[PDB]
């Protein structure tokens, strides 16, 4: 079989691939997230992500939990700054029950006051668990510093709003942002007609685009945490291209050129240019990678570094200088080709797994409507020229930069110095 894409009159996009596999995964992708939160209702997306099991009009919390557990299914909510994804996975025989539960959760939530009040503590528990890794807080501050608007909103509820999220705010967010034009129902192992029937059954109401968030505006600020951790996590980024643009592919190739993630366990990241460039200067435990974030309105590109507090300045400066060297034209065709191969392989490996394939189909459907075959994506990667990579590096170097740093920060440079 092949993936079948249907744009319904209400604006909903239905996709199905019959993999003829023992397990079937159905995911509703909604164009809502931290970005569409205003200042008043900050963190509502977080509680909405947590409130996937609360009592709905169709079913109670007990029924949802017990039934999904009884069939051995899983209900998962995945949230990005621009997207929220509700997915149910179970055996193909019992997919109908979990589909009914999923649409009941997504389309008819009750948000009863007592249940939301009980769940409000899970906001703080989740925030603490997520912030155990410093990367989460560093990236939250990086987004807050880079943008003055929608994209700055954190994926986790602010601390002052932990107990203040109201059921009315949740209802308003759902009504104005969970809409048919914003939704895509993606199914693996489910026939297209069945998904279409269920979409008509539940997702008929709340049509339209809904409330529209303002365009993200670059702020070019710095946020320094000073949390006293031994190692210093510092990210220096500049504005880049929006997702699904030629310069976006150029920036991805540039990220792979500089070095994104080690491929050999306990290796030296020999191909990674930033890694070696920093390593020659600093002999202490260190780490460096290229941060490429692309969103519909805009994107951020830059360097993320983890190093000893004393040597943070050296690491950041060395990585920045390596990017400067790339920008000046010291880029070999072989490096570009190797990065292109790495990126194409990464895309294929990401779409290899069922979860990865579902996420990719949902993201393409929400961002761009239609589904592009993997071959065309690889062709887009190939089309990128070395000149485009050089120009992306020049844009990063020249553009105004935003920085987030966490740790001792005694020697961590400020944005002006860099």
């Amino acid at each position: 079989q092949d993936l079948e894409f249907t744009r319904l009159p209400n604006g909903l996009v239905i996709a199905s691939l019959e993999n003829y596999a023992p397990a079937s995964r159905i995911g509703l992708f909604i164009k809502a997230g931290s970005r569409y939160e205003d200042s008043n209702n900050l963190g509502t997306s977080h509680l909405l992500r947590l409130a996937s099991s609360l009592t709905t009009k169709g079913a109670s919390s007990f029924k949802i939990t017990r039934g999904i557990e009884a069939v051995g299914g899983k209900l998962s909510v995945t949230s990005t700054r621009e997207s929220m994804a509700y997915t149910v996975e179970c055996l193909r025989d019992d997919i109908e029950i979990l589909m009914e539960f999923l649409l009941n959760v997504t389309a008819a939530p009750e948000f009863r006051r007592w249940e939301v009040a009980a769940l409000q503590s899970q906001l703080r528990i989740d925030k603490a668990v997520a912030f155990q890794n410093p990367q989460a807080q560093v990236l939250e501050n990086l987004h807050a510093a880079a943008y003055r608007n929608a994209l700055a909103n954190s994926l986790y509820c602010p601390d002052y709003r932990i107990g203040k999220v109201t059921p009315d705010q949740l209802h308003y967010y759902v009504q104005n942002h969970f809409t048919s034009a914003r939704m895509a129902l993606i199914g693996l192992g489910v026939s297209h007609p069945v998904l279409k029937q269920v979409a008509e059954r539940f997702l008929n109401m709340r049509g339209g685009l809904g409330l529209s968030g303002a365009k993200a505006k670059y702020r070019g600020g710095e946020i320094r945490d000073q949390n006293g951790d031994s190692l210093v996590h510092a990210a220096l980024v500049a504005e880049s291209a929006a997702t699904g643009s030629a310069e976006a592919n150029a920036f991805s190739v540039l990220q792979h050129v500089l070095g994104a993630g080690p491929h050999v366990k306990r290796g030296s990241n020999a191909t990674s240019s930033l890694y070696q460039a920093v390593a020659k200067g600093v002999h202490q435990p260190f780490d460096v990678s290229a941060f490429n974030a692309s969103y519909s309105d805009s994107g951020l590109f830059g360097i993320y570094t983890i190093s000893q507090a004393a040597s943070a300045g050296d690491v950041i400066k060395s990585a920045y200088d390596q990017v400067k060297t790339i920008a000046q034209g010291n880029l070999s065709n072989t490096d570009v080709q190797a990065a292109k191969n790495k990126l194409k392989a990464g895309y294929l490996m990401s779409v290899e797994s069922s979860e990865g394939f579902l996420d990719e189909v949902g993201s393409q459907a929400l961002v761009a409507g239609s589904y592009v075959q993997p071959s065309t994506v690889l062709q887009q990667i190939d089309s990128v020229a070395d000149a485009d990579v050089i120009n992306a590096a020049k844009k990063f170097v020249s553009g105004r930069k935003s920085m987030a740093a966490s740790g001792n920060l005694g020697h961590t440079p400020f944005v002006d110095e860099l």
Partner: peptide
């Protein structure tokens, strides 16, 4: 390395995804 700060869950799995954030060889070093 996005390092999507996933949360362990059954019947309710809140996962939040960020962008490539390194933390690649810290254990190695």
């Amino acid at each position: 390395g996005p390092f999507c700060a996933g949360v362990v869950g059954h019947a309710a799995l809140p996962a939040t995804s960020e962008s490539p954030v390194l933390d690649a060889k810290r254990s190695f070093l």
